Scaffold this active site. Structure first.
Site, PDB file in Angstrom:
ATOM      1  N   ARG A 275       0.779  -1.232   0.000  1.00  0.00           N
ATOM      2  CA  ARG A 275       0.000   0.000   0.000  1.00  0.00           C
ATOM      3  C   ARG A 275       0.819   1.295   0.000  1.00  0.00           C
ATOM      4  O   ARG A 275       0.415   2.370   0.446  1.00  0.00           O
ATOM      5  CB  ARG A 275      -0.949  -0.034   1.195  1.00  0.00           C
ATOM      6  CG  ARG A 275      -2.359  -0.227   0.696  1.00  0.00           C
ATOM      7  CD  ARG A 275      -2.430  -1.529  -0.033  1.00  0.00           C
ATOM      8  NE  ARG A 275      -3.741  -1.798  -0.548  1.00  0.00           N
ATOM      9  CZ  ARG A 275      -3.914  -2.892  -1.277  1.00  0.00           C
ATOM     10  NH1 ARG A 275      -2.915  -3.742  -1.545  1.00  0.00           N
ATOM     11  NH2 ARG A 275      -5.108  -3.156  -1.784  1.00  0.00           N
TER      12      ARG A 275
ATOM     13  N   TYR B  49      -5.152 -16.479  -3.252  1.00  0.00           N
ATOM     14  CA  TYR B  49      -6.173 -16.131  -2.243  1.00  0.00           C
ATOM     15  C   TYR B  49      -7.588 -16.607  -2.523  1.00  0.00           C
ATOM     16  O   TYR B  49      -8.022 -16.837  -3.654  1.00  0.00           O
ATOM     17  CB  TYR B  49      -6.321 -14.633  -2.006  1.00  0.00           C
ATOM     18  CG  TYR B  49      -5.275 -13.952  -1.135  1.00  0.00           C
ATOM     19  CD1 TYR B  49      -3.907 -14.151  -1.340  1.00  0.00           C
ATOM     20  CD2 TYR B  49      -5.690 -13.036  -0.167  1.00  0.00           C
ATOM     21  CE1 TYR B  49      -2.955 -13.432  -0.602  1.00  0.00           C
ATOM     22  CE2 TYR B  49      -4.747 -12.310   0.574  1.00  0.00           C
ATOM     23  CZ  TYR B  49      -3.378 -12.506   0.348  1.00  0.00           C
ATOM     24  OH  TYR B  49      -2.430 -11.727   0.992  1.00  0.00           O
TER      25      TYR B  49
ATOM     26  N   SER C 254     -12.247  -1.079   1.178  1.00  0.00           N
ATOM     27  CA  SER C 254     -11.639  -1.447   2.450  1.00  0.00           C
ATOM     28  C   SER C 254     -11.039  -0.229   3.145  1.00  0.00           C
ATOM     29  O   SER C 254      -9.930   0.210   2.847  1.00  0.00           O
ATOM     30  CB  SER C 254     -10.593  -2.503   2.175  1.00  0.00           C
ATOM     31  OG  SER C 254     -11.221  -3.555   1.433  1.00  0.00           O
TER      32      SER C 254
ATOM     33  N   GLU D  82      -6.519   3.087   4.723  1.00  0.00           N
ATOM     34  CA  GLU D  82      -5.976   3.090   3.386  1.00  0.00           C
ATOM     35  C   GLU D  82      -6.490   4.335   2.651  1.00  0.00           C
ATOM     36  O   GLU D  82      -5.829   4.899   1.772  1.00  0.00           O
ATOM     37  CB  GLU D  82      -6.423   1.841   2.646  1.00  0.00           C
ATOM     38  CG  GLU D  82      -5.759   1.718   1.281  1.00  0.00           C
ATOM     39  CD  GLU D  82      -6.221   0.584   0.377  1.00  0.00           C
ATOM     40  OE1 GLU D  82      -7.010  -0.271   0.783  1.00  0.00           O
ATOM     41  OE2 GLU D  82      -5.770   0.563  -0.766  1.00  0.00           O
TER      42      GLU D  82
HETATM   43  C1  LIG Z   1     -15.770  -0.797  -3.845  1.00  0.00           C
HETATM   44  C2  LIG Z   1     -14.317  -0.403  -3.876  1.00  0.00           C
HETATM   45  C3  LIG Z   1     -13.332  -1.404  -3.920  1.00  0.00           C
HETATM   46  C4  LIG Z   1     -11.978  -1.068  -3.904  1.00  0.00           C
HETATM   47  N1  LIG Z   1     -11.018  -2.037  -3.997  1.00  0.00           N
HETATM   48  C5  LIG Z   1      -9.673  -1.721  -3.892  1.00  0.00           C
HETATM   49  C6  LIG Z   1      -8.573  -2.774  -3.953  1.00  0.00           C
HETATM   50  O1  LIG Z   1      -8.898  -3.931  -4.133  1.00  0.00           O
HETATM   51  N2  LIG Z   1      -7.304  -2.385  -3.795  1.00  0.00           N
HETATM   52  C7  LIG Z   1      -6.913  -1.098  -3.653  1.00  0.00           C
HETATM   53  O2  LIG Z   1      -5.743  -0.842  -3.540  1.00  0.00           O
HETATM   54  N3  LIG Z   1      -7.871  -0.115  -3.631  1.00  0.00           N
HETATM   55  C8  LIG Z   1      -9.195  -0.371  -3.740  1.00  0.00           C
HETATM   56  N4  LIG Z   1     -10.194   0.556  -3.723  1.00  0.00           N
HETATM   57  C9  LIG Z   1      -9.693   1.947  -3.576  1.00  0.00           C
HETATM   58  C10 LIG Z   1      -9.442   2.588  -4.956  1.00  0.00           C
HETATM   59  O3  LIG Z   1     -10.127   1.961  -6.019  1.00  0.00           O
HETATM   60  C11 LIG Z   1      -7.932   2.651  -5.237  1.00  0.00           C
HETATM   61  O4  LIG Z   1      -7.192   3.144  -4.138  1.00  0.00           O
HETATM   62  C12 LIG Z   1      -7.643   3.449  -6.530  1.00  0.00           C
HETATM   63  O5  LIG Z   1      -6.259   3.515  -6.831  1.00  0.00           O
HETATM   64  C13 LIG Z   1      -8.260   4.849  -6.510  1.00  0.00           C
HETATM   65  O6  LIG Z   1      -8.803   5.112  -7.803  1.00  0.00           O
HETATM   66  P1  LIG Z   1      -8.960   6.616  -8.097  1.00  0.00           P
HETATM   67  O7  LIG Z   1      -8.358   6.858  -9.471  1.00  0.00           O
HETATM   68  O8  LIG Z   1     -10.433   6.918  -8.040  1.00  0.00           O
HETATM   69  O9  LIG Z   1      -8.158   7.506  -6.974  1.00  0.00           O
HETATM   70  P2  LIG Z   1      -8.511   8.870  -6.307  1.00  0.00           P
HETATM   71  O10 LIG Z   1      -9.313   8.614  -5.045  1.00  0.00           O
HETATM   72  O11 LIG Z   1      -9.197   9.768  -7.316  1.00  0.00           O
HETATM   73  O12 LIG Z   1      -7.074   9.455  -5.935  1.00  0.00           O
HETATM   74  C14 LIG Z   1      -6.322   8.785  -4.935  1.00  0.00           C
HETATM   75  C15 LIG Z   1      -5.099   9.573  -4.507  1.00  0.00           C
HETATM   76  O13 LIG Z   1      -4.168   9.595  -5.625  1.00  0.00           O
HETATM   77  C16 LIG Z   1      -4.033  10.911  -6.181  1.00  0.00           C
HETATM   78  N5  LIG Z   1      -4.087  10.734  -7.602  1.00  0.00           N
HETATM   79  C17 LIG Z   1      -5.207  10.160  -8.116  1.00  0.00           C
HETATM   80  N6  LIG Z   1      -4.933  10.236  -9.539  1.00  0.00           N
HETATM   81  C18 LIG Z   1      -3.648  10.983  -9.688  1.00  0.00           C
HETATM   82  C19 LIG Z   1      -2.739  11.488 -10.738  1.00  0.00           C
HETATM   83  N7  LIG Z   1      -2.980  11.295 -12.025  1.00  0.00           N
HETATM   84  N8  LIG Z   1      -1.617  12.199 -10.388  1.00  0.00           N
HETATM   85  C20 LIG Z   1      -1.376  12.421  -9.072  1.00  0.00           C
HETATM   86  N9  LIG Z   1      -2.079  12.009  -8.064  1.00  0.00           N
HETATM   87  C21 LIG Z   1      -3.207  11.294  -8.465  1.00  0.00           C
HETATM   88  C22 LIG Z   1      -5.108  11.738  -5.523  1.00  0.00           C
HETATM   89  O14 LIG Z   1      -4.713  13.105  -5.444  1.00  0.00           O
HETATM   90  C23 LIG Z   1      -5.310  11.022  -4.179  1.00  0.00           C
HETATM   91  O15 LIG Z   1      -4.317  11.386  -3.169  1.00  0.00           O
HETATM   92  C24 LIG Z   1     -11.570   0.242  -3.812  1.00  0.00           C
HETATM   93  C25 LIG Z   1     -12.563   1.247  -3.814  1.00  0.00           C
HETATM   94  C26 LIG Z   1     -13.914   0.946  -3.850  1.00  0.00           C
HETATM   95  C27 LIG Z   1     -15.074   1.917  -3.867  1.00  0.00           C
END
Ligand SMILES: Cc1cc2nc3c(=O)[nH]c(=O)nc-3n(C[C@H](O)[C@H](O)[C@H](O)COP(=O)(O)OP(=O)(O)OC[C@H]3O[C@@H](n4cnc5c(N)ncnc54)[C@H](O)[C@@H]3O)c2cc1C
Length: 340
Positions: free
Chosen positions: A157, A188, A227, A323
């Protein structure tokens, strides 16, 4: 401007400004403007990993920089993807286009640019396994910087962009290296029910989608960031002493001899499943997923988080970490100090 569509939790808060970057240069012009006005800027893909605590005093840039480039090498197909690309559409496109290796990360939300930042994990594989290099811009210089898989400082992470580089760099493309000889990761859950001599990429993808779609809460009905907490990773000694009194805490051996404890079990031992504090609630089957059940505001999620951290911490002396990323009025704040 309402962040409630740019938030998988469903929390309604406002940013002073919202803008969709379709390309690198537009992302830089927007960042240079907001920062010249004294504003904080926050880059974002789908909101699936943020918790907005206050209303945001700056510009949010939704990164929609699209583009898939396949390249064949003898050893592997090297993909060059844009930070605005959807991750689960990328997992079904590579499995449709004859390229196995990404199925165990299917149906994770967010954008491809997000995935090096938190190093998305599921079912044994983490991004790090298929990540060649990452392309990002130094926002204060215009400067393209290509970091390779080592210089990214990947961990459980974790990455460099979680601390040294977060507000400096902006990810605009990711380089994935998918090997031509597929090793199936059947380590898993129900994937353990699969024999490695009969297993096809498509049925691995299938098993993982059913597990996720049945156990986890859909954001359409229940607002969440999946999570909420990271599965604790303890050392073999600290683990051994816990397994002498709790002997089936479902634990996984990490690469370095460390032990990953399942946070879903520990919470559930504390009889926390279903606990509503305001409209925020502990999900009943998946006790790690804190949800927005009945018009939950940020304090509801912070207070139930603190309480779930405090009861698991008393019963087991395993102090949980979030997380999800906490966003205050003028930028990011320590998730633990906020829920401690
Ligand atoms: C139902 C559900 C299940 C999930 N399962 C998982 C899983 O299995 N494993 C896991 O690790 N996570 C999981 N997540 C969390 C999430 O999907 C991940 O952490 C994912 O990487 C975030 O996607 P996002 O692009 O929407 O990030 P955001 O929430 O939009 O951004 C996350 C962070 O990264 C930064 N960031 C985002 N895009 C950029 C960019 N281009 N440049 C710089 N910074 C950026 C943001 O500023 C912020 O700090 C889950 C979420 C949900 C709702």
């Amino acid at each position: 401007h309402s962040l409630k569509p740019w938030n998988t939790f469903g929390i309604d808060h406002n940013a002073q400004h919202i803008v969709c970057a379709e390309d690198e240069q537009q992302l830089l012009n927007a960042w240079q403007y907001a920062t010249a006005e004294g504003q904080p800027v926050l880059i974002l893909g789908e909101g699936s990993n943020v918790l907005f605590l206050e209303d945001y005093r700056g510009t949010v840039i939704i990164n929609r920089i699209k583009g898939i480039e396949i390249h064949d090498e003898p050893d592997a197909w090297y993909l060059h993807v844009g930070a605005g690309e959807n991750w689960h559409r990328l997992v079904k496109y590579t499995l449709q286009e004859g390229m196995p290796g990404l199925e165990n990360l299917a149906l994770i939300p967010g954008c491809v640019g997000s995935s090096p930042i938190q190093n998305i994990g599921a079912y044994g594989v983490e991004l790090q396994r298929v990540c060649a290099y990452v392309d990002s811009v130094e926002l204060a210089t215009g400067k393209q910087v290509r970091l390779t898989a080592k210089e990214c400082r990947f961990g459980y992470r974790d990455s460099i962009f979680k601390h040294e580089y977060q507000d400096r760099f902006a990810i605009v493309a990711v380089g994935l290296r998918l090997p031509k000889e597929w090793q199936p990761v059947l380590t898993y859950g129900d994937l353990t029910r699969l024999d490695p001599t009969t297993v096809t990429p498509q049925q691995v993808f299938n098993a993982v989608c059913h597990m996720r779609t049945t156990k986890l809460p859909d954001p359409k009905v229940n607002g969440n960031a999946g999570s909420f907490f990271k599965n604790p990773v303890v050392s073999a000694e600290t683990a051994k002493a816990l397994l002498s009194q709790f002997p089936t805490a479902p634990n996984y051996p990490q690469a370095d001899g460390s032990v990953k404890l399942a946070a879903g079990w520990l919470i559930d031992q504390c009889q926390l499943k279903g606990m509503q504090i305001g409209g925020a609630a502990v999900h009943r089957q998946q006790a790690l997923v804190l949800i927005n059940e009945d018009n939950a505001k940020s304090e509801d999620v912070v207070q139930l988080a603190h309480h779930v951290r405090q009861k698991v911490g008393e019963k087991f002396n395993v102090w949980l970490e979030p997380e999800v990323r906490f966003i205050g009025a003028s930028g990011e704040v320590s998730a633990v100090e906020t829920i401690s």
